[PDB]
Amino acid sequence: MASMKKKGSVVIVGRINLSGDTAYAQQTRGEEGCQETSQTGRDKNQVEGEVQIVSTATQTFLATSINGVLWTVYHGAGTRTIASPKGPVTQMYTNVDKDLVGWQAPQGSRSLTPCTCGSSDLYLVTRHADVIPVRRRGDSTGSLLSPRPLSYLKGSSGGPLLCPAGHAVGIFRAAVSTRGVAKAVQFIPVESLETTM
Numbered sequence: 001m002a003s004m005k006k007k008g009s010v011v012i013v014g015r016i017n018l019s020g021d022t023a024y025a026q027q028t029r030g031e032e033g034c035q036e037t038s039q040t041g042r043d044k045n046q047v048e049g050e051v052q053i054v055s056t057a058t059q060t061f062l063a064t065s066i067n068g069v070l071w072t073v074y075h076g077a078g079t080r081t082i083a084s085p086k087g088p089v090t091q092m093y094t095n096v097d098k099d100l101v102g103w104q105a106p107q108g109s110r111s112l113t114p115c116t117c118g119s120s121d122l123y124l125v126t127r128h129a130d131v132i133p134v135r136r137r138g139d140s141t142g143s144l145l146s147p148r149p150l151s152y153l154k155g156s157s158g159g160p161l162l163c164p165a166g167h168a169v170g171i172f173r174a175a176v177s178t179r180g181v182a183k184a185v186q187f188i189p190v191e192s193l194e195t196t197m
């Protein structure tokens with residue numbers, strides 16, 4: 001019981017840059033470094049942007065900042081802390097029934113704003129910065145306009161689904177697939193984010 005360990009913190013290893021001409025993923029911490037920043041929690045690298053790429057010692061996914069909170073998904077993060085300059089940081093929101101968790105948006109970062117103009121055709125940002133047209137077919141669901149394998153959507157949970165203007169409509173959570181070809185998607189409607197707040 002003395003020779004016991006603890007599940008390290010979630011570490012920011014990069015970001016999906018969207019603030020210019022094109023969308024592209026940037027790496028900020030290697031694998032050997034992330035394996036350490038998760039064991040300590042002391043993350044010195046400053047934060048920029050809205051969509052961050054996060055990793056645990058065994059998995060990797062995304063996290064989106066909205067209304068001043070860095071949201072992600074529970075099945076990737078769990079109750080883990082996040083590495084901040086001032087050590088680990090406890091989540092200020094945890095709802096397993098929704099598969100949702102959140103930390104205070106670190107400084108130096110920007111937080112999207114919920115879309116209030118009614119989203120019709122959404123755009124899903126993937127782990128590899130790809131922007132995939134989604135046709136909102138529900139309140140938390142959206143069919144894909146172009147079919148592609150599930151393998152290109154794995155590790156994208158916690159990412160954003162965006163208005164044509166760029167506001168946030170939800171948080172990619174699960175995928176609807178048949179025969180290995182993803183046909184639709186589901187997300188956490190940003191209104192439920194507000195309700196949790």
Ligand SMILES: C=C[C@@H]1C[C@]1(NC(=O)[C@@H]1C[C@@H]2CN1C(=O)[C@H](C(C)(C)C)NC(=O)O[C@@H]1C[C@H]1CCCCCc1nc3ccc(OC)cc3nc1O2)C(=O)NS(=O)(=O)C1CC1
Pocket residue numbers: 059060061062074075076096097098099150153154155156157172173174175176177186
């Ligand atoms: C392909 C990419 C896809 C975005 C990803 N999401 C998933 O794979 C989720 C995880 C799990 C199964 N998922 C699915 O998408 C399934 C699957 C058949 C597997 C495609 N699809 C599906 O159900 O269709 C039905 C409409 C949905 C409604 C019913 C499902 C409800 C969703 C859900 N809620 C909870 C609450 C609490 C929990 O505690 C442990 C756990 C949960 N797990 C869940 O779904 C992803 O990349 N993750 S990740 O980044 O690689 C990860 C390593 C970090």
Ligand SMILES: [Zn+2]
Pocket residue numbers: 114115116117118119163164165166167168
């Ligand atoms: Zn909008």
